[PDB]
């Protein structure tokens, strides 16, 4: 327990799982939502996948 001639300043990161709050004012963005396309992918005899 002899103190050396230097001084150490120990640095560490700390990962913290926080819980944010999101505000967004009335009519902030504007969405142009279109009618979706449907495409029959799996032409199976057991079950069809659209």
């Amino acid at each position: 327990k002899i103190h050396p001639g230097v001084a150490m300043t120990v640095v560490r990161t700390d990962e913290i799982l926080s819980e944010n709050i999101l505000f967004s004012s009335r009519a902030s963005t504007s969405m142009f939502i279109g009618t979706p396309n449907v495409s029959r992918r799996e032409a199976r005899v057991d079950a069809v996948t659209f």
Partner: protein, 148 residues
């Protein structure tokens, strides 16, 4: 012969919409219905600034209308609906017999259930894209409070 009375428990699932949820306050959402008609990614903003009538200096100035341009982001969500084959075969051949009306109603019920899971998945992807483009363009409070 009635041989057992089995009790099953079907899970109750909340089917959400983008208008029933409450972050539709933030977004004025429209039915464009053909997004290929807008090929230009940039939307022209015509910000018109008003003016205060100063009589003291007599330095009269009309309104300074400046124009910035801003990019329109586009997003593309895709889910799949699993409709079985035999229920679609029941759904095509509409019957007239009152004993096959029950099998038709069962096929309609399971096809409507699979469609409802697909539509609910799309209306849960809309909310996810809206939250993603809200959280992409949201600066932290400790900068925005003193900046704005």
């Amino acid at each position: 012969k009635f041989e057992v009375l089995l009790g099953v428990y079907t899970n109750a699932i909340q089917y959400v919409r983008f208008l029933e949820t409450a972050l539709a306050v933030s977004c004025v959402n429209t039915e464009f219905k053909d997004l290929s008609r807008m090929t230009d990614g940039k939307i022209q903003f015509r910000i018109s600034v008003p003016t205060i009538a100063h009589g003291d200096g007599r330095r009269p100035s009309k309104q300074r209308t400046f124009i910035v341009v801003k990019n329109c982001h586009k997003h593309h969500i895709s889910t799949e609906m699993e409709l079985s084959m035999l229920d679609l075969e029941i759904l095509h051949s509409i019957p007239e017999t009152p004993v096959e009306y029950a099998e038709y109603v069962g096929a309609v019920k399971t096809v409507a259930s699979a469609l409802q899971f697909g539509v609910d998945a799309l209306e849960r992807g809309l909310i996810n894209t809206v939250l993603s483009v809200k959280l992409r363009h949201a600066p932290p409070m400790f900068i925005l409070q003193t900046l704005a």
